[PDB]
Symmetry: D2
Subunit: 226 residues, 4 copies
């Protein structure tokens, strides 16, 4: 038994556990690395993609180490360490501004009850910028070449998607229109935003598979799991 | 200066001569517009500009201007890059109309606001829509505009400026853009925090704007 | 066909009209050469070609032919790439000579091998002779790689990696590729693709097997 | 004390110990991975470059895992995991053909005494192709998009350089001419051929080449 292939395919995976996630603080652009569990998560995701026979032409990540390292591990499992990889800040998680590094108690002190409800249930609430004296992740040398005016400092999910969307349209879509299979190793908020965009509208270790025809009609969205 | 950006406007198109609004309608240069391009190339040549790369929109009147300018500059070999995000506003319903028909279609209040925020209506049923051109067949159909205000035009041109132009200036390159007037004005307004004339922006290695000069044969 | 490659020779240049050998000397198209390019475009249009990308050499006669062809095809927006590795042979000392002068500069045996073979390497440019490679358009190249007197075999040895690295991967992606080329380069590519010892059309399957070679003319 | 910087810089590193190297067999294109010692070698190379202050704009590797993995480790140590990375078969080690997988005893019986001397002291001796029934590393799906006629099967060092040189000229020089700092994580034969080319001629050491805006070589430095 064999299945007719689509003209192009986009697979999106979430990165695994990071050190902040284990410490129960918000990272955003704070460049927290994978834990040992998060490294195992990446091996498991590679094995999941290998068992489905995926061969990618290109892989995208954000500028954050948790995503880049996940990508490297997954490509190792897939025997695809040689393929073209592309990293870009537009795929970063939201920049949480003042909330960077906060735990639950600190978030609860900073936001009112109504704000905290909106932050959990909606995508429109914007955090304040980093405070004077607070370490701002965007001061990292990896961002030294960006237009300083574009660099976010406190971003709602909606704002994050407004600066990720042109990257998806300008770099990922043209490759799908060439008939490529594309992998993206993403942050959860970015992955959900892309899914909503594509569908016109998920377990921790699940992957999303989007299949397209040669006119970029969406033919299928499949969730794959262990 | 560490880097330099030159922006030039294309010359007269046939719709402009006929006094109709084109937007994405792919009107070509007149013979006068062709001479405008030769004049612009001679102006840049007299100022000694050598470019590493030239950008245009997907509209022929911009592409053709670029080709003529590079020819005058003896730079026909340099990398050229064309992209829809540098296109003029898509005028939707108003596409192809003259000044009188804009008056009959928009109210006195509509034309009064016609500022940078007024979004024209989309192309009417049966109206030829310039975005149905095969040159756009590879774009994400969701992103294609149908009636754009200048504000909306800039919202989709700005990411291209930030992702393609700024990184080349940050590398120390000399960049030419052959642009539409509205796009040129939005870029000037962004950079400054606000016929044959060109704009020359000079930057240091931190992307501070050191100076803007307007050059002309006069 | 899974993929298609079209190779076209550039139109007449000024050196061909005054009957001298150009090589890298950057002679432009004549008025007849301009008409040659319009006719080539009309031929490709009548056969329904739509390209994803066009290649040229760094020499004006090739670039200008490419631009005219794309104009006729209504494909002025597509990606174009120009590169020195597709240049004609650099004729060194023989650059700018006519047939009488080459007969005077080369021996009887040498003149015979140059016409019947592809292995004779001309001497380098003489001291005081204007060398076309001192053009600023080559200022970014590794100076060690720049030829000075090239046989046809030597030209192919430096064009071949470019063909393999930039043209073949696009054909393996299923693209339609146009190359505007110089005659010796077009012949070398034909010989490579067919394994042998006015446009060419090569049609391939998805493992890069040549299914058919067609010669199209008006 | 601050030193005036060059217009552009190329750093070339060699990958560390592979499993074939530990087992004393020739690999070539055989896609042998790093050992745990070669992984430590890569961490040390990263620390060396870190201690010298290098920040790269781009990194190149071959298509072989031992080079790619070394690149990934070095960039991790450098905190440069985000930078552009490019892999290409033209930077691969020689394809050793028939000699792929052989140990010193098998090489000695395969080659005559004159051949062996030339093999050691020169760069012109070409090995035969892979035999029928021998696994040929170029049958890997990673090479499926290549023109089948370009794929080597037994290369001398001279032939390896003839196919690597165009990549150096067409991909690495243009970036240097833009003023970039470029890292290459390479194989020893490839590194030596580049040095010979650039100059016109220890374990863990790196080579640093500095250029002006006309691509004049200004300095070759060995760091360790």
């Amino acid at each position: 038994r064999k299945k007719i292939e689509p003209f192009s395919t986009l697979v999106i995976l979430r990165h695994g556990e990071s050190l902040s996630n284990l410490n129960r603080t918000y990272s955003g652009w704070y460049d927290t690395d994978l834990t040992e569990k998060g490294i195992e998560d990446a091996y498991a995701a590679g094995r999941l993609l290998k068992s489905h026979g995926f061969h990618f032409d290109v892989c995208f990540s954000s500028y954050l180490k948790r995503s880049i390292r996940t990508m490297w591990i997954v490509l190792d499992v897939l025997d695809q360490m040689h393929i073209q990889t592309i990293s870009n800040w537009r795929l970063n998680e939201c920049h949480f501004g003042l909330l960077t590094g906060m735990n639950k108690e600190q978030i609860c002190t900073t936001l009112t009850e109504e704000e905290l409800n909106i932050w959990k249930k909606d995508t429109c609430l914007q955090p304040p910028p980093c405070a004077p004296g607070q370490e701002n992740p965007s001061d990292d040398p990896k961002y030294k070449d960006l237009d300083p005016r574009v660099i976010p400092n406190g971003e709602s999910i909606d704002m994050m998607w407004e600066r990720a969307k042109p990257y998806f349209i300008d770099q990922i879509v043209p490759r799908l229109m060439e008939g490529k299979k594309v992998l993206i190793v993403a942050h959860g908020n970015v992955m959900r935003a892309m899914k909503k965009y594509l569908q016109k509208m998920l377990s921790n270790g699940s992957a999303l598979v989007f299949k397209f025809d040669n006119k970029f009609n969406l033919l299928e969205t499949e969730i794959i799991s262990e």
